[PDB]
């Protein structure tokens, strides 16, 4: 089997990106952020309380004739950015992109925190790291592509984020229309329940690319590339203007100029990001101060390669015996 689903950013920024998902019979389509960075589908639902939901679509497991519910189950998620949900967990049938799992757990919110309220356009998290950081106790459940993956006529998926534009999340196949070149392939570490896999180097501009191994994580969940202050510092220097504000919480730009690109290795291959891909726009309505999209990871613990990076690119979640991770150009 396979899937497709297009995925579209939630505002002019790309601040995120939510897919549609079908949850239970008949069918509750949900909009969802897909997160290669955690292992939770959670979603927003009739047991959220009600102060915390502000326009999102909810899940309403007594209206599905397959929501069954995971009897004693129950899930808390804390995320990096200091956002949480928590609640209960249903097993239901969810379809992506016309692909169909039955048994998903579901995982119901019934708290989450307020900058998910805040996000009236995302109904919840589909995750899609492994499943060893899946937070249902007292028996963790599986993620989606897990579950599917037996049926998936390939066990691989493919992200394909758009710039200010829609993209594709694929299940099963490799589309060999939507990239150009090769894809590259390089090496996954699951020890941290991540696809974590090592950068071979940087360049910033036209400059010399620069030879050196920067270990990080492929998020889609995350917004910016986060990436050593070494690498981040050299990067702005290359901005007149662009300083470090501790009081906005990262690198800012003056909104007039104009960014250079920003290139990652993956094995020999190189990996352009636009220089407006890092643009993340007034750090306030109608400041001329712009808030950039490479950030230090020094406070976070790991280098992130989030959607700044990934939507320079075709990349394949390679979820074969041995992971892996594949990057074209497109
Ligand atoms: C999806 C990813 N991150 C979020 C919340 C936490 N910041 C807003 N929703
Ligand atoms: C809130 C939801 N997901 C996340 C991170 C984990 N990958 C992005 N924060």
Redesign the pocket.
Known sequence: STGSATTTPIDSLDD?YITPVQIGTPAQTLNL?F?TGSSDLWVFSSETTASEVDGQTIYTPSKSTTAKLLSGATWSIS?G?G?SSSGDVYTDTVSVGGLTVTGQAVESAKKVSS??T??ST?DG?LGLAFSTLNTVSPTQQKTFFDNAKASLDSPVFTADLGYHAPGTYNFGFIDTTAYTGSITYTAVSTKQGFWEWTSTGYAVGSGTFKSTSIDGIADT?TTLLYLPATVVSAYWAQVSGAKSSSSVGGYVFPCSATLPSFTFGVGSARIVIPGDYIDFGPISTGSSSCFGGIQSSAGIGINIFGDVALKAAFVVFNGATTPTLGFASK
């Open positions: 995120a952020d997160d995320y950015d956002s900058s998910f805040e996000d995302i998290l969940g």
